[PDB]
Amino acid sequence: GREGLIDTAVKTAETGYIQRRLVKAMEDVMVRYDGTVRNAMGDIIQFAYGEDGLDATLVEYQVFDSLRLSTKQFEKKYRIDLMEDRSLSLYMENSIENDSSVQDLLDEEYTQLVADRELLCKFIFPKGDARWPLPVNVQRIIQNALQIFHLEAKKPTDLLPSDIINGLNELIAKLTIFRGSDRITRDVQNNATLLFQILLRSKFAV
Amino acid sequence: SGKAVAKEDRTTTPYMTKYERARILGTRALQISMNAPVLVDLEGETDPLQIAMKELAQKKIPLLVRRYLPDGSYEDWSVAELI
Amino acid sequence: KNVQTQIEHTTLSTVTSATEIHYDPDPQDTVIEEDKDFVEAFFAIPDEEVEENLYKQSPWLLRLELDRAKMLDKKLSMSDVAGKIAESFERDLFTIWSEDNADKLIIRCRIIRDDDRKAEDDDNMIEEDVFLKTIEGHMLESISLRGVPNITRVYMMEHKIVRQIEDGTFERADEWVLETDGINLTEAMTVEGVDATRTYSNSFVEILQILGIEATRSALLKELRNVIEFDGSYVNYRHLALLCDVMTSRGHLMAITR
Amino acid sequence: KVIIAQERSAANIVQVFKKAAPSPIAYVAEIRSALERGSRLISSMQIKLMARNTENSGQTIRATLPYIRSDIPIVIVFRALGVVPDRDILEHICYDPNDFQMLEMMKPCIEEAFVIQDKDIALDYIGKRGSTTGVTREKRLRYAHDILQKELLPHITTMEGFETRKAFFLGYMIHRMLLCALERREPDDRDHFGKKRLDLAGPLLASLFRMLFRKMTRDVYKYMQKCVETNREFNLTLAVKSNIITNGLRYSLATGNWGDQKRSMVNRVGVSQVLNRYTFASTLSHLRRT
Amino acid sequence: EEKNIVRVFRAWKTAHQLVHDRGYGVSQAELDLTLDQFKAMHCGMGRNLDRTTLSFYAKPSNDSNKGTIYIEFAKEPSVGIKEMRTFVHTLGDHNHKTGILIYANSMTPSAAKIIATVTGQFTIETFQESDLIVNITHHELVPKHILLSPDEKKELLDRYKLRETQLPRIQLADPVARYLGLKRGEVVKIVRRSETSGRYNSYRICA
C-alpha cells in the first residue's frame, strides 16, 4: 500500500513539471487569419488548422460504410444498370420518366467512377481501421431526419437521380475553409476536406 | 509595415469568429457603460452588456474589425457584414 | 529462424570459458588435461608445409573452449568459427580445430614471426605477455557472423497484421516479427529478409540520419501514441499532430527540455 | 520543544555497497566507523576497485584513508604496518587453497607496490594534506604514524602498539569485495534500518555539548595569555564566561541549528520541533518521531 | 563467400532508380534487372573478378534547364585524391551538369574540398556504399517528395505571402535531400499520407 502511496506523491508534482515544459515551447504557436498556424516570428508550422482545418472540440468519430466491404457487396449497394435490373423503378414513384433519353443512364456510371476511385484510395492510405473522427455527424443528420418527415417504404421518393447528384456538388463546394480563388489556392481546399468528402458520396450516392 | 486590403477583394472568412463576438460585445459594453449613443430601441434593460447583446442580435452596432494578416496587411469588417 | 540468427552480435560469445595460456616449446608440445592432442598430431603428420618459408615458431599456445550451449541455437561449424579469424590478422595465427565428434570441441591459436624485423616505437623487455592480453581484446571483439555491431539479443513475437484481399474483405495475417534490443539500423536493412520497406526503430536520433525528416515526424506521432493509449486514453490526432510539427519544423530535432 | 530522532549511517560495517556506471569506479567498501568512546565520531574510509578501460589495465584496487588525500593502492598500507614481505599480505585477505581466482585480482594490486618498497617510501608517499607545508621526510613520516593512530580505522584501538590488529581488517574488508566481483554473493542492503541506528535525545545532546565545551577551553585559554602578560595574579572566577552555553543552548535547541547564532549555517535542520499538542493522541505520536 | 559482389547488385536499385524521382530518362529494362540479369550484362572472369566499367550515364526529358548526370562507381575502396580530381576531367569531357561517385569506406578530407571549389555551377554528390544501397524512398514512413521549379517556388511565397526563410527547412545531410539532390534554396512539395482528414500537402526548403 505504501508504494502506490508514494507513486501518488509523485504524480502530484512531476505531472506538473512536464506540463509546463510543453507550454513553454508552444505558447509561440497560434492560428493566423490566413488559415494557417504560425510561430512567434511568423515561421509557419502548419498549413491547415490542424491538417484537418477544423476545431477539435466540434467533432465526432464517424464510420466509413464503404470500406470494409466486399467488392461483391459493394456493387450491391451503389452500382446500377439496365441489365436485367431496373428495380428502382419500383421506388421512382411518383414519376419514372421512364428512363427518358440517355443522360440518366450516364449519370449513374459517372457517380460510381468517383465513388469507386474512393474505394481503392483508400485504402492505399489507411491500414484497415474504419472509425475515424470527422466534423458533423452525417450518420445522424439523416436520423433524426427520418423522424422529422418520416415517410416509410410505402411512400416512394418524390426525388430524382439527377438532383441528389447535383445536391452534393453544390453543397460540398459550399464547405470551403480556405479562401479563396485565387486559383491554385483552391487546391489546398479541395483536399483539405477530401476525407470529409468521400463520406458525402458514400452516404448520399444515388 | 501595413499595406491595407481591398474592401472589394476580401480573403478571410465571411463569418464572425468565436473570439470577435467576445471582443465586440466587450467593447460596446464599455461604450454604453460610458453613456453612449445606443443604436437600438431600448428594450428596458439595465446591463450595459445585456443591452449590447440586444444590438448584436439586430446587427445594429457600430465598431469594425481590422484583421491583421501575417503579411502586415489588413481587412475591415462591419458588424452587419459578418456572420 | 534463418534471419532470427542472421542479425545478432555473435562474436566470441560461445567461448565464455574460455581462454587459457599454455607455454609449449617445440611445435610438437602439449599435455592435458583431457584428450585432444591426437587431433594436433594428425594435423602435423600431413606435413604439407610445416617448415614453410619460416619454420617452427610460436611459443605461445592459446586454447579455446567453445560451448555447445550456443552451438545448437546458432548454426555454427568449427571450421567457420576459426575460419574467419585469419581474415583480419594475416597469418599471425594458425588455427587447428576438430570435428563435431569431439567431447570438448577445442581450437588452438599460435603465434609465429622471428626472425621478424621487430620494432618499433616502444620497446618490449620482460616479458612476452602484455602484447598478448591486448590481442585478445580485439579477437573476442571481432567479429564474423551476421552480427550487426551493437545489435544485441533479438526476439520474435506474432504481430497480428491486417491485410487486404482480392475479394474486398480484410484479414488478420498473423506474421512473425523480431524485436531488436538496441542500436543500430542502417546495416540492418542490408540483410536478406528483411525488410527495408518496413523496418522501424525507437531512436528518432537515427531515423533522421537514415530515413527522411518527414519520416521522422511520423515516428514521433507513432511513438507518442504508444505512450498515451495503452490503455484507454484520451487521444486527439490534432494536438499530437501539432507537437510533432513543432519538433520537426526547423530541420534538426528540437528537444523540449525544462 | 521535543528533540526528534534521526537515522544516518550505522558504523562498524562491514558493508559492500557498490555502484555503476557513470562510470568511474566499480565496487566500494565504506566503513565510516569511529569511536564511539562517548561522543566523537568524525571519520570515514571507503576503498575503490575499478574495472573499466579494457586498455588500462587489469582491474586494480586502491584505497583512500581519510581525510587526505588521493588514492593509495592496498599493498602500500600493509607495508606501512608491519607486513612488507609479500605472500604474508595475501594471507590476511584470502586463504589458499585457493582459489587463485579471488587472489589473482591481486596481481594488478601488488604491481602498484612494485616500488614501495619497504617502510621508508611507504610513509613517504603520504605528503598531501593539506594547505602547503612539510619539508620534508622526517616530518612526513611522523604524520603517517599519527594517521595510523587515529585516522586508519580509528576504532579498535587508538593506543600505540597495536598496528598488527588493523592489519587483518583491511584483509577482511577486501575479502568481501572479492566475493562480489567474482559474483560469489550479493552487495549488502542499505535498506536496513536493521543496520541503521536511531540517535535519540542522548547521542544528540552529546555531540552538541562537546561542540560547546571545546570552545570553553579555548575562550579561557586565551584569557590566560592576557593574564600572564601585563597581568598575572594567577587566576580565579575572573573569566569562565557565563553566557557561553546557557544562551548557547537556548537558541540552539529553540531552533533547528546546532551552534547558533554562530556561523554554523547549513547545520542540518532540527530535530527540535515544538510540541504539537492538538490532541492528546498526537502529543504522544510526536515524542516518537525520527 | 562472394557476398560483397551480390551486395552491389543493390547499388542499381539505389541508382538507376534514382532518376525519376528527378526527371532523367532511364530504361524500364534497367529497373527490372534480376540477380543474374546483372551478371549477364557484366562479364567477369569468375565467379569473382567483377569491376570493369561499372558506371554509365543517362539523359533527361525536361528538355531545357540542362543538363545531364553521370553515375560512376569506383570500384576502388577508400577514396581518395588518386581517383577524385583525376575523375573530373572525364566529367568535363562529355560535359555533364553533375554526377555521382560512391565509395567504401570513408573518404579523406583532402579529396573533398579541392573539388567543390572550382566546380563552379556544377556539383559533386555525394553518397557512398554500405549506407544508401537500398532506396529509402520505398518506406511506409517516407512520403514522396517532388521537386519545385523556380516558377512554382514563387507561387508559395505569394499564395501564402511568406519569406524564403519562414518555411519548413530541411538539413542537407538528409538522405532525401541527397537523394533528389536538393541544393540550398530549392523548395520541395510533399504529399503526406496524412489522415487528416484528407491528403494534406506540406512544403519544405533547404539549409
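The interface with chain A takes residues 11-13, 67-70 of chain B (CB under 8 Å).
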